[PDB]
Amino acid sequence: GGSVEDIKAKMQASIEKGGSLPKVEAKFINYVKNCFRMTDQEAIQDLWQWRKSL
């Protein structure tokens, strides 16, 4: 379907078209997990690692 890659691309798309990602780990986890159901510790770790490098 979409996987983690789709989520990253979508977030990047919104960011490029006028968006922003929470700098807080907990706020980030809540946004990604709640928005993309990313409740997987692996996905959260990768998504968080991405935010840290983003």
Curated annotation (Swiss-Prot):
Residue numbers spanned by region Required for nucleolar localization: 3-54
Residue list for modification Phosphoserine: 3, 14, 20
Modification type Phosphothreonine: residues: 39
Domain of life: Eukaryota
Outcome (variant: residue 8 to A): Partial destabilization of the structure
Glycyl lysine isopeptide (Lys-Gly) (interchain with G-Cter in SUMO1) crosslink, residue number(s): 8, 17, 27
N6-acetyllysine PTM sites in chain numbering: 10, 17, 27, 33, 52
Modified residues (N6-succinyllysine): 27
Cross-link type Glycyl lysine isopeptide (Lys-Gly) (interchain with G-Cter in SUMO2), residue numbers: 8, 10, 17, 23, 27, 33
Protein purpose: Involved in diverse cellular processes such as ribosome biogenesis, centrosome duplication, protein chaperoning, histone assembly, cell proliferation, and regulation of tumor suppressors p53/TP53 and ARF. Binds ribosome presumably to drive ribosome nuclear export. Associated with nucleolar ribonucleoprotein structures and bind single-stranded nucleic acids. Acts as a chaperonin for the core histones H3, H2B and H4. Stimulates APEX1 endonuclease activity on apurinic/apyrimidinic (AP) double-stranded DNA but inhibits APEX1 endonuclease activity on AP single-stranded RNA.
Recorded family membership: Belongs to the nucleoplasmin family.
Disease: A chromosomal aberration involving NPM1 is found in a form of non-Hodgkin lymphoma. Translocation t(2;5)(p23;q35) with ALK. The resulting chimeric NPM1-ALK protein homodimerize and the kinase becomes constitutively activated. A chromosomal aberration involving NPM1 is found in a form of acute promyelocytic leukemia. Translocation t(5;17)(q32;q11) with RARA.
Quaternary structure annotation from Swiss-Prot or TrEMBL: Decamer formed by two pentameric rings associated in a head-to-head fashion. Disulfide-linked dimers under certain conditions. The SWAP complex consists of NPM1, NCL, PARP1 and SWAP70. Interacts with NSUN2 and SENP3. Interacts with the methylated form of RPS10. Interacts (via N-terminal domain) with APEX1; the interaction is RNA-dependent and decreases in hydrogen peroxide-damaged cells. Interacts with isoform 1 of NEK2. Interacts with ROCK2 and BRCA2. Interacts with RPGR. Interacts with CENPW. Interacts with EIF2AK2/PKR. Interacts with CEBPA (isoform 4).
Name the UniProt record assigns to this protein: Nucleophosmin
Residues of the full protein shown: 243 to 294 of 294
